[PDB]
Design a protein around this nucleic acid. Structure first.
Ligand SMILES: [Mg+2]
Ligand SMILES: [Mg+2]
Ligand SMILES: [Mg+2]
Ligand SMILES: [Mg+2]
Ligand SMILES: [Mg+2]
Ligand SMILES: [Mg+2]
Ligand SMILES: [Mg+2]
Ligand SMILES: [Mg+2]
Ligand SMILES: [Mg+2]
Ligand SMILES: [Mg+2]
Ligand SMILES: [Mg+2]
Ligand SMILES: [Mg+2]
Lengths: 143, 110, 136, 99, 154
RNA sequence: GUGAACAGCCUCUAGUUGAUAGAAUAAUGUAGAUAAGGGAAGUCGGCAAAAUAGAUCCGUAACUUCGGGAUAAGGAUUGGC
RNA sequence: UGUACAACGGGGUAUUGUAAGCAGUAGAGUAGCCUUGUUGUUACGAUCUGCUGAGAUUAAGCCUUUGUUGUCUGAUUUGU
C-alpha cells in the first residue's frame, strides 16, 4: 500500500476480531471473566477499565466513561449486531455446506442472539451504575 | 481518381500519449494528429482548425481525450503553391460519443 | 550439531535476525526472548544470522520470572509471522513470532505450549510435538 | 525388510501402499480417483444414495416443468394498450431526441 | 489436492494461488487474491462490498437456497471404494450442474421483468415533451429524401 | 473564500506568458518518493529520515530564588444532516 | 499485389466497484393546511433502495478476427 494503512494495519499492530468479540459477549461467565481481570504490568490501567466491544484497555475509569459516551464506541456496537460472518457464510455463498450454515443461522436467531442481547443489556446497566460518581484522579495503589 | 476527398476518422490518442510528460501531453497530440493526417492522405501540408485546437486543449495541458472524431479533407493550393499542390485540412465533429464509429466517406454537395 | 532434530530440515524463509524480540509460548515463567545467536548458520561478511520456524537459537529472557533472567538458554522457534511456502502450494503466515525454552538435547523445559505450532517444527522436534495441543 | 533388501536398498525400494487394500474386487486395487471434474471436488459429491437424490431431483424438476415457469417464451406486453408499429416509432423518436 | 473458497470474496482458490492467514485459534483464512486479502487486513465488510457473493446472496441478486445447492457437503465419514459408484457420481455432477444453471437463469429472468414497460414509459414521456425538437427531425428527414433523390436522379 | 491570522492554498481588478529549441528514455548523477520480516544489528557519532503536531475536555513529578518548571509526562475526542 | 499491410470496428481476457437520469407508503425531524388523525396530508431533508457485477478502461511490448476504409512508394552503389 502507501504509508497510512501500512502504519495502521501491520501484522504486529493487529487488533481483535469481531467474531471473537461476539463469542466474548455471549456466555455471561465470559463477561464476568473479562470484567474481573487480574493485575498486569503491561496493560494501561493495570489490566482494569476494559471495554469488551472495542477490545482496548483504558487508563482511568473516567476515560472509560467518556469513551462510552463517544461515537467510536457506537460504531463498534452497531457493527456487533447480527450474524458475525464466519467461513460458513463464504462456503454457503459458494454453494457448499449450505445446510450447516442454515442450521447455524436459525440457531443464532433462536438461542445465542437473545442471550447476547440480554448480557449486553445487563453489562450496560452495570457499567452505568459503576461509572457514575467516579473521581478523575486515580489511586495508584494496586492492592 | 479524384484526389479531392473528405472522410471521417476516429483517432485513438490514448495509446499514442502513453507515458508522456504532463506538461507535454497536449502539445504532443497536435503532432500526432498531423502525423495521422499525413499517413492517411499522403500530404505533407496539414492545417488544423482552431476549433480542433480548442477541443484538444479543453481540459488543460494534461487532460486530453482518449478518442477523437475528425473530418479530414484534401484540397488544392493557391498562387505560390510552394512544393505541394495538395494539402489536408482537419476539422472537429462534436458528436455525442466518439466510441463505436467507423471510417466513412463524406459526399460533398458544394 | 543439529542435536535433537529428527532427520533433515528443508529451506524456509528466515524471519528473525539477531536482535529480535519474540514471545515465549510455554508456561515455564518467561514472557519474551531476545535472540542473540542462531545455531548452524553460515559465515558471510556483513550478513546477520537469521532464524526461521523450527530452528534452535540462543536467547536471553528480558521480561518474566526473576529467576529466568540474566542467563543464556536454548530456544526453539515455533511461530514465524514472515510468510513462507508449503510444498503443497500456498504461502502462509502467523500473527506473531514465538518460541519455547529447551535444553541442548532438544527436550522442553515447560509442560504445555499455548497457541498453535507450525507442523514443520512439530515434525522436526518430537518433544515439541508431545507438549502441544494445537498443530497449525 | 527382506523384500526391501532384495528389491534395492533402504532408500531405493519403493513400496506399493495400494497392495494391501481390502476391496470387493481385485482389479480395483490399482485405480485412481478422479478428484476434480470442472471446478468441483468429487469428494464433496461422493456419497451413497446419490442416485436416489438425483432421482428425486429430476422428478421435482419435471413436475416443475409441467407446471411451467420455464416458459422463456413469455410475451404478455400490455405496454399502454399501444400497437407495435407506433411502439417502434416512439422508440426510434426518443432515441433521436436523446442523441 | 483441493479447491478452496476465498474467505472474503467466495471465489475458487486453486493450488499455488493466494495466501493463507492462520489465526491464534487455528482458524485458517485462505484468500483468493491480494485484493480480497488487503480488504480483510483493512477490516472492511464483505456483506457491504458489492462485488462479493455474500453481498449478492444477502441482497437477493442471486438465488440462495435450492435443492441443487444441497449436494456438496464436507463428507467426514468415508466410503470404501466402488468403481460403479464413482462413475455414477461423475455422471450426476454434470446433470446437477445443468439443472442448477437452468434455475439460475430462471431467477434472473424473473427479477428483470419490468424493463420493457419502464423503458416505454420514459420514452413516451420524452416524446410527449419537446414538440419543436421533433420538427427539426421532420425537416431533417424531408431534406434527406429530396437531396438524395435528386442526387439519385443524376 | 478557507482559517485565530497580512500563514499556506484557490479566485476578481490590473499585469505577464519572459528564460535556445526538436527527438528519444542507457549507465552515473541532482531534486524527490514507496517498500515484506526485523527494528540501530549501521556509523567516530540515531547523521539523515520517520514518528509528533491545530482545537475541546480530563490530568500533570522531582526540584525551586515560591515567581516558575508546564504545552511537563499521560489520556478521551473531532465529518455530514 | 493478397488468411499483403495499416487505421478503425467486433469478440475474448483482465482492472475497478455499481454510471448519468428517473422513480419510491424508505428516511432522525421541523414547518404549512383539514375533521389534530386504531402510518392525516403537503414541503424540505444527509442518507437508503430499484432499473444496474452496472458504467468506465483494455497494448501503448495481451490474444483473436468471414466487418469498414485506405495504401502497396522513392533514392544510392556494387563485376570474377
Ligand atoms: Mg515513462
Ligand atoms: Mg471566518
Ligand atoms: Mg489568507
Ligand atoms: Mg520495512
Ligand atoms: Mg547504534
Ligand atoms: Mg554499535
Ligand atoms: Mg560495527
Ligand atoms: Mg536529525
Ligand atoms: Mg522538564
Ligand atoms: Mg479493440
Ligand atoms: Mg445511477
Ligand atoms: Mg447494483
Amino acid at each position: 500500500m502507501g504509508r497510512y494503512s501500512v502504519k495502521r494495519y501491520k501484522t504486529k499492530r493487529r487488533t481483535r476480531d469481531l467474531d471473537l468479540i461476539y463469542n466474548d459477549l455471549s456466555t455471561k461467565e465470559s463477561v464476568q471473566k473479562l470484567l474481573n481481570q487480574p493485575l498486569d504490568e503491561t496493560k494501561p490501567g493495570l489490566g482494569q477499565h476494559y471495554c469488551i466491544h472495542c477490545a482496548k484497555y483504558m487508563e482511568t475509569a473516567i476515560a472509560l466513561k467518556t469513551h462510552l459516551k463517544g461515537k467510536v464506541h457506537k460504531r463498534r456496537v452497531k457493527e456487533l449486531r447480527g450474524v458475525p460472518y464466519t467461513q460458513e457464510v463464504s462456503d454457503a455463498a459458494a454453494g457448499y455446506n449450505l445446510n450447516k450454515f442454515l442450521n447455524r443461522v436459525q440457531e443464532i436467531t433462536q438461542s445465542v442472539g437473545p442471550e447476547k442481547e440480554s448480557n449486553e443489556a445487563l453489562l450496560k446497566e452495570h457499567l452505568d451504575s459503576t461509572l457514575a460518581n467516579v473521581k478523575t484522579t486515580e489511586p495508584t495503589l494496586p492492592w | 481518381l479524384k484526389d479531392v476527398v473528405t472522410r471521417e476518422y476516429t483517432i485513438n490518442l490514448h495509446k499514442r500519449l502513453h507515458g508522456v510528460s504532463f506538461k507535454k501531453r497536449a502539445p504532443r497530440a497536435v503532432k500526432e494528429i498531423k502525423k495521422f493526417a499525413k499517413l492517411h492522405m499522403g500530404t505533407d501540408d496539414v492545417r488544423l482548425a482552431p476549433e480542433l485546437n480548442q477541443a484538444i486543449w479543453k481540459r488543460g495541458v494534461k487532460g486530453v481525450e482518449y478518442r477523437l472524431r475528425l473530418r479530414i479533407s484534401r484540397k488544392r493550393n493557391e498562387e505560390e503553391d510552394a512544393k505541394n499542390p495538395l494539402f489536408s485540412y482537419v476539422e472537429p465533429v462534436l458528436v455525442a460519443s466518439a466510441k463505436g464509429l467507423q471510417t466513412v466517406v463524406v459526399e460533398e454537395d458544394a | 550439531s543439529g542435536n535433537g532434530a529428527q532427520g533433515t530440515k528443508f529451506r524456509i524463509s528466515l524471519g528473525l535476525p539477531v536482535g529480535a524480540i519474540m514471545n515465549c509460548a510455554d508456561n515455564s515463567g518467561a514472557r519474551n526472548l531476545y535472540i542473540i545467536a542462531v545455531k548452524g548458520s553460515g559465515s558471510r561478511l556483513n550478513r546477520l544470522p537469521a532464524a526461521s520456524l523450527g530452528d534452535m537459537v540462543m536467547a536471553t529472557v528480558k521480561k518474566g520470572k526473576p529467576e529466568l533472567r540474566k542467563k543464556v538458554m536454548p530456544a526453539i522457534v515455533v511461530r514465524q509471522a514472515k510468510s513462507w511456502r508449503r510444498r503443497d502450494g500456498v504461502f502462509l503466515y502467523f500473527e506473531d513470532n514465538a518460541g519455547v525454552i529447551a535444553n541442548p538435547k532438544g527436550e522442553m523445559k515447560g509442560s504445555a505450549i499455548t497457541g498453535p505450532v507450525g507442523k514443520e517444527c512439530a515434525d522436526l522436534w518430537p518433544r515439541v510435538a508431545s507438549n502441544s495441543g494445537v498443530v497449525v | 525388510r527382506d523384500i526391501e533388501a532384495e528389491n534395492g536398498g533402504a532408500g531405493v525400494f519403493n513400496v506399493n501402499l495400494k497392495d494391501k487394500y481390502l476391496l470387493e474386487d481385485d482389479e480395483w486395487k490399482n485405480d485412481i480417483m478422479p478428484e476434480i471434474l470442472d471446478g468441483k471436488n468429487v469428494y464433496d459429491f461422493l456419497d451413497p444414495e446419490i442416485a436416489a437424490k438425483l432421482q428425486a431431483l429430476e422428478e421435482e424438476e419435471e413436475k416443475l416443468e409441467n407446471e411451467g415457469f420455464y416458459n422463456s417464451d413469455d410475451e404478455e406486453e400490455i405496454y399502454d394498450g399501444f400497437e407495435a408499429s407506433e411502439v417502434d416509432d416512439i422508440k426510434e423518436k426518443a432515441a433521436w431526441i436523446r442523441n | 489436492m483441493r479447491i478452496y473458497q476465498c474467505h472474503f470474496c467466495s471465489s475458487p482458490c486453486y493450488p499455488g494461488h493466494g495466501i493463507m492467514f492462520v489465526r491464534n485459534d487455528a482458524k485458517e483464512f485462505r484468500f483468493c487474491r491480494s485484493k480480497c486479502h488487503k480488504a480483510f487486513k483493512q477490516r472492511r465488510n464483505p456483506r457491504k462490498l458489492k462485488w462479493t457473493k455474500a453481498f449478492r446472496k444477502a441482497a437477493g441478486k442471486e438465488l440462495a437456497v435450492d435443492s441443487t445447492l444441497t449436494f456438496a457437503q464436507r463428507r467426514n465419514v468415508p466410503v470404501r471404494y466402488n468403481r460403479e459408484l464413482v462413475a455414477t457420481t461423475l455422471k450426476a455432477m454434470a446433470r446437477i450442474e445443468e439443472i442448477r444453471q437452468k434455475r439460475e437463469r430462471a431467477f434472473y429472468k424473473n427479477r428483470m421483468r419490468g424493463n420493457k414497460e419502464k423503458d416505454f414509459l420514459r420514452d413516451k414521456k420524452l416524446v410527449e415533451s419537446n414538440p419543436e425538437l421533433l420538427r427539426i427531425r421532420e425537416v431533417e428527414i424531408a431534406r434527406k429524401l429530396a437531396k438524395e433523390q435528386e442526387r439519385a436522379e443524376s
